[PDB]
């Protein structure tokens, strides 16, 4: 019966492939051949943030595009005032092995996690004057790779045990569990409307999940190796993914197939992070070779380079108002570019 | 100029001072990564000295602070989080000598660890434990069961030397690494001193690197 089931699955997959190909009327490049190229953009570093000892792994922008939070493997989670370069808070972590951080939309909480397999929530606006641990979520069975807030009371977490979770903060229980992946889940991104989310999980595939219903809706299997980053397109109808094979790809939820791939012959290093601009025309990708690249999401050509760091760029982020882009690195410095 | 941003600057400078003060203390402790086969003497080494994610443990010796991280609990592709321990000063290793079925997997994992891109210099440490159990077992059953190519005499010293060679020969780039070796015992606590000598040699090499000689 196992052979029969595998044959049925293969036939269904062939049917899916045929249906997807039937829709491939034209390529995005051919349609976009007429638009004017963005030319060349040369951004510059305006601020440098100093104070971390070890390599910095993650960072997140505030919803006001003024404050930001950075997490370093030396056991420190710092909050920076970007405009003036001051430091507001310096939370010491219980576990030094932090692999992610997040900033709540309202600015009242900050979440972190790592190899401890626990997601910790910190309250910033207490009456006592010191940041305290508000809640600890301890249901996973693997390292936490990413986490994002939906509101002040719900959080989505991705772990290396091949499953994702939706948690109710106040009660401290797993409200929902998402399963179906084969490898470890690395990256996570929430839709602008906040009803769906995607993830790529070290099996060369990305999945679309419904937050309220708790089932997998679509699967995309274009890449060749482990996907490390993911980010929604501003309108919420497409998303870009970077993998260890040194190439990026753009997928569309409604067409259900790969649209375009960004690669070059001189790049043989993987991508660690990706991000879009406010208008979505520029795709910024951090690479393993100590510099970040700025691609045209429509023309598939390299528009710019950022080469301020001296080690592996691990985290990249754009502000909500699109004024500046912040990049961290293993050299323990954060550069804000504009 | 600064209406009340002067107080914010004062607070930021105090935060900087505290961060630097803590960093000056964090750079004075030596980190060790503890690996080994499941159910092996991984915690046996820790238990012998006066010592689910990570099981970080700490102790002190000769005015030197030691951290040891047991990452065997993690069940995932090591390729994605193994780079976190690039700055450690040792890769302390354990292998059972009894069991006999845990051996092949052990060789594969040891070979993977040695030839890892990150641990191209970090001095590996090797601990053979369960020595009495192996001494009795080889006498009870020949060691050739899992060693078809075995041709030496069925004697404890011969077999021990054979397996030691079979373990140290996985290392390929012998110029950089400084793999040690030591036969652990059920009693007579010495292992801490053996890890002390290794770390004191690593410290000398680090000091030479800092100076510039090499």
């Amino acid at each position: 019966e196992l052979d029969q089931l595998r044959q049925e699955a293969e036939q269904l997959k062939n049917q899916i492939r045929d249906a997807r190909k039937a829709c491939a009327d034209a390529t995005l490049s051919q349609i976009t051949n007429n638009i004017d190229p963005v030319g060349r953009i040369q951004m510059r570093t305006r601020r440098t943030l100093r104070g971390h000892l070890a390599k910095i792994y993650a960072m997140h922008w505030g919803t006001d595009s003024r404050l930001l939070v950075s997490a370093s493997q030396d056991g420190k989670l710092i909050i920076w005032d970007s405009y003036t370069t001051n430091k507001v808070h310096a939370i010491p972590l219980r576990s030094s092995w932090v692999m992610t951080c997040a900033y709540a939309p309202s600015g009242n909480y900050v979440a972190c996690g790592g190899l401890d397999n626990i997601c910790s929530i910190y309250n910033l606006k207490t009456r006592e004057g010191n940041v305290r641990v508000s809640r600890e979520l301890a249901g996973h069975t693997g390292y936490l790779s990413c986490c994002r807030f939906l509101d002040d009371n719900q959080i989505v977490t991705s772990s290396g045990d091949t499953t994702c979770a939706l948690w109710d903060i106040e009660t401290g229980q797993q409200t929902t569990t998402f399963t179906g992946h084969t490898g470890d889940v690395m990256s996570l991104s929430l839709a602008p409307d906040t009803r769906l989310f995607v993830s790529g999980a070290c099996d060369a595939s990305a999945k679309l999940w419904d937050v309220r219903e708790g089932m997998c809706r679509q699967t995309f299997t274009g890449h060749e190796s482990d996907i490390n980053a993911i980010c929604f397109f501003p309108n919420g109808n497409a998303f870009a993914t970077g993998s260890d094979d040194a190439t990026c790809r753009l997928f569309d939820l409604r067409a259900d197939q790969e649209l375009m791939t960004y690669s070059h012959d001189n790049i043989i290093c993987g991508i660690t992070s990706v991000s879009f601009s406010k208008s979505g025309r520029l795709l910024l990708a951090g690479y393993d070779d100590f510099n970040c690249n700025v691609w045209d999401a429509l023309k598939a050509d390299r528009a710019g380079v950022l080469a301020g760091h001296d080690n592996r760029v691990s985290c990249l982020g754009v502000t909500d108002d699109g004024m500046a882009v912040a990049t961290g690195s293993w050299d323990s410095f954060l550069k804000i570019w504009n | 100029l600064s209406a009340e941003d002067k107080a914010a600057v004062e607070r930021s400078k105090m935060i900087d001072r505290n961060l630097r003060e803590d960093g000056e203390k964090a750079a004075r402790e030596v980190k060790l990564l503890l690996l080994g086969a499941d159910n092996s003497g991984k915690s046996t080494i820790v238990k012998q000295m006066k010592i689910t994610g990570i099981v970080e443990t700490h102790f002190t010796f000769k005015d030197l602070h030691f951290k040891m991280f047991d990452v065997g609990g993690q069940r995932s592709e090591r390729k994605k989080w193994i780079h976190c321990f690039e700055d450690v000063a040792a890769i302390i290793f354990c292998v059972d000598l009894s069991d006999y079925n845990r051996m092949h997997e052990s060789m594969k994992l040891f070979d993977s660890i040695c030839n890892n891109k990150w641990f191209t210099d970090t001095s590996i440490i090797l601990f053979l434990n369960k020595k009495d159990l192996f001494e009795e077992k080889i006498k009870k059953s020949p060691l050739t069961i899992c060693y078809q190519e075995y041709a030496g005499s069925n004697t404890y010293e011969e077999a021990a030397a054979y397996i030691q060679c079979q373990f140290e020969d996985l290392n390929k780039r012998k110029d950089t690494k400084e793999i040690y070796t030591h036969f652990t015992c059920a009693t007579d606590t010495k292992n801490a001193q053996f890890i002390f000598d290794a770390v004191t040699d690593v410290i000398i090499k680090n000091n030479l690197k800092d100076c510039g000689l090499f």
Partner: single-chain antibody, 232 residues
Framework: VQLVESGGGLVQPGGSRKLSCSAS????????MHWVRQAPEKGLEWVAY????????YYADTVKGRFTISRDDPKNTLFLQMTSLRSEDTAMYYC??????????????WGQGTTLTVSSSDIVMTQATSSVPVTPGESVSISCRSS???????????LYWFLQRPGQSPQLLIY???NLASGVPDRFSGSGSGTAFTLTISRLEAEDVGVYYC?????????FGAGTKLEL
């Protein structure tokens, strides 16, 4: 969270005295401290300030030279040493806390007060409307004035509001002229451009009768106003 002060009493002119303010329930080491004065029937008047870490000990002109302010962090205490006391130093003294960082709300918590009696280029704030009859359920509006514009280049506006109820210590309502404090109802509001400000209360109810004070925090000699009083 609480602060209690002690050390007051009766002192002959030309003597010396020492007050004490003990804090509990919060992180003392992370807060700067302030001393404030209140004459028997006049408004408030800033006295002395000390910052976290003891790096800024600004004083007031009326007492600069014969006063001293110092703090003990491990013991969680604040001190004030006064020498050569005069007849003009008879008043009630309040201990206040303030924390300064982006988005903070300084002057949030005040003490209880301690009474002291002696036997026998600054910004000017005006509160000309010293009396206002009010009736429950009707809206009321208070006004304030300044000498020079309080707006700063960085978009801030340092004007504060405080309420003193009958026989009670003051409390914070609105910081920086637009932001509501923590715990106050949502019917309080405040607005106004540089050199003129106005507080607004909608659906006035009991527990709002008292004296309303203004305050500036743009420069060193912090200055209060005469105060406006509401009566039934």
């Amino acid at each position: 969270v609480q602060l209690v002060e002690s050390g007051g009493g009766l002192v002959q002119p030309g003597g010396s005295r020492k007050l004490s303010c003990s804090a509990s329930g919060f992180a003392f080491s992370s807060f700067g401290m302030h001393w404030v004065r209140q004459a028997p029937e006049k408004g408030l008047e800033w006295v002395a300030y000390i910052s976290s870490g003891s790096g800024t000990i600004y004083y007031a002109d009326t007492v600069k030279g014969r006063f001293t302010i110092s703090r003990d962090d491990p013991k969680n205490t604040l001190f004030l040493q006064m020498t050569s006391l005069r007849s003009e130093d008879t008043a009630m003294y309040y201990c206040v806390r303030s924390i300064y960082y982006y988005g903070s709300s300084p002057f949030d918590f005040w003490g209880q007060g301690t009474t002291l009696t002696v036997s026998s280029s600054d910004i000017v704030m005006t509160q000309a409307t010293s009396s206002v009859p009010v009736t429950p359920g009707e809206s009321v509006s208070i006004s304030c004035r300044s000498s020079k514009s309080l707006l700063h280049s960085n978009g801030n506006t340092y004007l504060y509001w405080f309420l003193q109820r009958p026989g009670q210590s003051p409390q914070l309502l609105i910081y920086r002229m637009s932001n509501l404090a923590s715990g106050v109802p949502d019917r309080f509001s405040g607005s106004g451009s540089g050199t003129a400000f106005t507080l607004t209360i909608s659906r006035l109810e009991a527990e709002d009768v008292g004296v309303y004070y203004c305050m500036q925090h743009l420069e060193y000699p912090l200055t209060f106003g005469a105060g406006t009083k509401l009566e039934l």
